[PDB]
Amino acid sequence: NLCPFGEVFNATRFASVYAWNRKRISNCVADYSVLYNSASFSTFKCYGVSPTKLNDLCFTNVYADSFVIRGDEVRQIAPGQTGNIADYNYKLPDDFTGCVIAWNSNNLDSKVGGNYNYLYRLFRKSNLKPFERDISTEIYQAGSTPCNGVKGFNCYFPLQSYGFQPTYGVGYQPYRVVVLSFE
Amino acid sequence: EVQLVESGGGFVKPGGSLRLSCAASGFKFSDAWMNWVRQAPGKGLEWVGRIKSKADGQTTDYAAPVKGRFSISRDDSKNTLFLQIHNLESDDTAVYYCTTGALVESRYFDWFTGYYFDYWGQGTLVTVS
Amino acid sequence: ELQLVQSGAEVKKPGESLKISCKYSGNISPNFWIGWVRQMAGKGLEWMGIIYPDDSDSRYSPSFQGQVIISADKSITTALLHWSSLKVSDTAKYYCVYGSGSPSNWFHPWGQGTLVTVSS
Amino acid sequence: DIQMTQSPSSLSASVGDRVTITCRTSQGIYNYLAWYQQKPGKVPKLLIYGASTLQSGVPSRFSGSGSGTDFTLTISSLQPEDVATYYCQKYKSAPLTFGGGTKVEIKR
Amino acid sequence: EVVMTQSPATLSVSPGERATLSCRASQSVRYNLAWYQQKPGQAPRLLIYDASTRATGIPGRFSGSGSGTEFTLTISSLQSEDFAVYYCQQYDNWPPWTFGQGTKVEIK
């Protein structure tokens, strides 16, 4: 009756950072030393919980969120930081209690001659709220003059592509991220 | 300060093709939008095409009497722009420029959007005989 | 990633359509591109393009006129190379090269012994 | 295809006088327009943008005034070193089409 | 496109004595390269990659060298099974992946 963690971590293809997926786990047996004692996870750090103490803690609900971001950008995944992701893409409330995982997936996502399947927002009027996401692709407004759906001046399409490539520097190499939130 | 240089003009003969180039100097040229403008002898200027930044589509917007010809392409990793004149008829005899424009930033990122043209090259002269 | 096999071709007439067939063996990686390389008579090697069999992309080097690289099937695990009506210039020998992610051990299985295409 | 005119074309007055240049438009553009100056045999130079903003480092005798559907650029006083052709450019979106062009001569 | 020039065209060497190879690039290929070997009548075999690390199942006599725009391959023990044609290939800046020219190593 073990939890489906495997299909989340051994999944085929991940979503984009601005359109991250969300899954609910409840009424299940979850083991973590199998996840904890793995050399795969280049980065693995938790908050408010001892990583060894998970087996002693029960919860009503567990939420798993995943996406794909650039390598030298994982630092933005922490409660109380700034940056494009932490501003317009994914927010972490400071009262966070859960683990954050990230490992290099260069051999799974990057492709020769650019991979143009992953996006991220660049413009938005106001910052996000904790555990909140948006998908709308309305043309951004940057001045008092309204343009009404034309990408002329001061009206920019708010989505750009990462364009991963398997020969880039390790800073730009892609990274998969899994975020756990608790009761 | 920053400069752009172009080359490739010659005393060519019609019924063929020609390749023109423009090399950037001090931009963050990987992500900027660049333009070509062709000044005919003794006539006004005329915009002839734009190419995006390849991080936002790498699309091309040509002019109304141009759509059929004058292909534009970008070669990164060496900071070079490329205008491909697909066919010369008579009136391609003109001068050509490579220009960029406004700088726009929101909080973190900035890039020459190229909407009103600030920096111009010396301008190479093309002929049809 | 193991042995690849190609189908020994022979002469054709002036330009028609042909199909060149590489193969697979197994234990393949998630990222899976396979490329095609050609060698003139006593000259250096020239690249053509690669294809990722799952969600085929078929990115071409700028010589793509008689160059239609399509796997077109996982049924017999092949990476067919196809063109129509090429006449005199492309009398050569074409190798298929394997690859994977993590840019090591890409070019290891580099075809076996390959197809002397005769055009005229 | 928003046609624009830059009229007239033959303008000339004694030094120190005032000149009017008018970039009319067929469709409304809020304030998006620039002005370029090009002396004979050289690259054009920028003067204005937003229809009124002077360039940082240009003489301040040019007056970008209008907005809406008709614009005006006027030189406050004439000098003999500022004879060139001036170009008004539509600026809202593609296809960034320039203007016809106006030359300025000098009086007797 | 970057031309991968290779010098010398031929390299006449004696058996046993160490022999060296040189490959030239137009601009930065800083750490992506390879070195093949094509005994006549069969398909080329990868020898090294990343410009320094050897492949698997190859003799320890081969050794990569160089970086940036200058490279070098060195053979320490010419046996009877090393005279072949050697190509250098980049694998960055995708669209034109390019090879070199080859050096027909022979005897005397």
Element (H, E) at A36: helix A33-36
Neighbouring residues of D20: CB distance < 8 A, sequence distance ≥ 6: D72, D74
DSSP-based three-state secondary structure for E6: strand
How are beta strands B4-7 and A174-181 bridged, if at all?
unpaired
DSSP characters for B7-69?
E------SSS-EEEEEEESSS-GGG--EEEEEE-TTS---EEEEE--SSS---EEE-TTTTTS
The CA-CA-CA angle for residues C43, C67, C59, to 5°, reads: 100
Phi-psi region of D16 (alpha: psi -120 to 50; beta: other; left: phi over 0): left
Element (H, E) at D68: strand D68-75
DSSP A130: T
How are beta strands D102-106 and D10-13 bridged, if at all?
parallel
The side-by-side arrangement of strands in the sheet containing B47-51 is B60-62, B47-51, B34-39, B94-99, B124-126
Q: 3-state SS string over A78-105?
A: CCCCCCHHHHHHCCCCCCCCCEEEEEEC
The residue type at D52? S
* Structure token digits, residue D34: 């620039």
* Structure token digits, residue C43: 């000259």
What's the full length of chain C, in residues?
120
Nearest to B38 by CA among B14, B15, B18, B66: B66
Nearest to D62 by CA among D34, D41, D89: D34
How are beta strands B18-24 and E10-12 bridged, if at all?
unpaired
Side-chain-side CA neighbours of D42 within 13 Å: the count stands at 9
Q: Do A110 and C101 touch (CB under 8 A)?
A: yes
Is the CATH number of domain B5-126 3.40.640.10? no
Q: Are A147 and A155 in contact (CB under 8 A)?
A: yes
Spatial separation of the C-alpha atoms in residues A132 and D30, rounded to whole Å? 36
Spatial separation of the C-alpha atoms in residues A66 and A76, rounded to whole Å? 15
Q: Are C12 and C20 in contact (CB under 8 A)?
A: no
Contacts of A166 in chain C (CB under 8 A): 101-103
Spatial separation of the C-alpha atoms in residues A163 and A11, rounded to whole Å? 21
Q: Are E92 and E25 in contact (CB under 8 A)?
A: no
Spatial separation of the C-alpha atoms in residues E31 and E92, rounded to whole Å? 9
DSSP-based three-state secondary structure for C9: coil
Q: Are C4 and C109 in contact (CB under 8 A)?
A: yes
Instruction: Measure in Å the smallest separation between the Cα of A18 and chain D Cα atoms.
Output: 28
Q: Are B113 and B53 in contact (CB under 8 A)?
A: no
**Other CB atoms within 10 Å distance of the CB of residue A18:** 23
What are the extents of the domains in chain D? 4-104
Q: Are B36 and B82 in contact (CB under 8 A)?
A: no
What's the full length of chain A, in residues?
183
Q: Do A152 and D92 touch (CB under 8 A)?
A: yes
Task: Establish if A83 touches chain B: CB-CB under 8 angstroms.
Answer: yes
What are the extents of the domains in chain A? 1-113+166-183, 114-165
What's the full length of chain E, in residues?
108
Task: Establish if B110 touches chain A: CB-CB under 8 angstroms.
Answer: no
Task: Establish if A157 touches chain D: CB-CB under 8 angstroms.
Answer: no
Spatial separation of the C-alpha atoms in residues C110 and C77, rounded to whole Å? 17
* Structure token digits, residue D95: 């296809």
Nearest to B113 by CA among B34, B60, B54, B17: B34
Tell me: cis bond preceding D95? Omega within 30 of 0 counts.
Answer: yes
Work out the burial of residue A24: count CB atoms within 10 Å of its CB; fewer than 13 is exposed, 13-18 middle, 19 or more buried.
exposed
Q: Are C20 and C70 in contact (CB under 8 A)?
A: no
Hey, which residues does A29 pair with through a beta bridge?
Answer: A2
Spatial separation of the C-alpha atoms in residues D31 and E52, rounded to whole Å? 60
DSSP A44: E
Q: Are E89 and E71 in contact (CB under 8 A)?
A: no
CA distances from D96 to B125, C70, D32 (A): 22, 41, 11
Task: Establish if B96 touches chain D: CB-CB under 8 angstroms.
Answer: no
Q: Report the neighbours of C using a cutoff of 3 or more CB pairs below 8 angstroms.
A: A, E
Spatial separation of the C-alpha atoms in residues D56 and D48, rounded to whole Å? 9
Q: Do D96 and B35 touch (CB under 8 A)?
A: yes
Spatial separation of the C-alpha atoms in residues D9 and E29, rounded to whole Å? 55
DSSP characters for B83-102?
EEE----STT-EEEEEEB--
The residue type at D63? S
The residue type at B11? F
DSSP B121: -
* Structure token digits, residue D44: 């054009």
φ, ψ of residue A106 to 5 degrees: the values are -60, -40
Hey, which residues does E72 pair with through a beta bridge?
Answer: E22, E65
Nearest to C74 by CA among C120, C109, C7, C26: C26
Hey, which residues does A99 pair with through a beta bridge?
Answer: A46
Cβ density class E61-74: b for 16+ within 10 Å, e for less:
ebebbbeeeebebe
Resolution of the experimental model, in Å, one decimal: 3.4
Looking at chain E, which residue has its C-alpha nearest residue B77?
E93
Spatial separation of the C-alpha atoms in residues E4 and B63, rounded to whole Å? 38
* Structure token digits, residue C79: 């990476």
DSSP A75: G
Spatial separation of the C-alpha atoms in residues A152 and B100, rounded to whole Å? 16
CATH of domain D4-104: 2.60.40.10
Element (H, E) at A8: helix A5-9
Q: Are A102 and A74 in contact (CB under 8 A)?
A: yes
Spatial separation of the C-alpha atoms in residues A111 and C106, rounded to whole Å? 13
The CA-CA-CA angle for residues D37, D43, D44, to 5°, reads: 20
Distance of CA A40 to the CA centre of its chain: 18
| Alpha helix ranges (H) inside E33-84 | none
Touch between A and B (at least 3 CB pairs under 8 Å): yes
Spatial separation of the C-alpha atoms in residues B92 and B20, rounded to whole Å? 12
- Breaks in chain E after (C-N > 2.5 angstroms): none
Hey, which residues does A91 pair with through a beta bridge?
Answer: none
Neighbouring residues of E90: CB distance < 8 A, sequence distance ≥ 6: E2, E4, E25, E29, E32, E33, E34, E97, E98
Contacts of A168 in chain B (CB under 8 A): none
The side-by-side arrangement of strands in the sheet containing C34-39 is C59-60, C45-51, C34-39, C93-97, C115-116
Quote helix, strand, coil % in chain C, to nearest 5. Answer: 0, 30, 70
Looking at chain B, which residue has its C-alpha nearest residue A164?
B55
DSSP A9: H
CA distances from B18 to B89, B127, D93 (A): 12, 11, 29
Radius of gyration, CA atoms only, chain B: 15
Neighbouring residues of D60: CB distance < 8 A, sequence distance ≥ 6: D54
The CA-CA-CA angle for residues D79, D80, D85, to 5°, reads: 95
Hey, which residues does A25 pair with through a beta bridge?
Answer: A62
CATH number for E6-106 (one of 2.60.40.10, 3.40.50.720, 3.90.580.10, 2.60.40.1180): it is 2.60.40.10
Is the CATH number of domain C17-117 1.10.3720.10? no
Q: Are E67 and E86 in contact (CB under 8 A)?
A: no
DSSP E88: B
Q: Are C32 and C54 in contact (CB under 8 A)?
A: yes
Work out the burial of residue A89: count CB atoms within 10 Å of its CB; fewer than 13 is exposed, 13-18 middle, 19 or more buried.
buried
Q: Are B99 and B37 in contact (CB under 8 A)?
A: yes
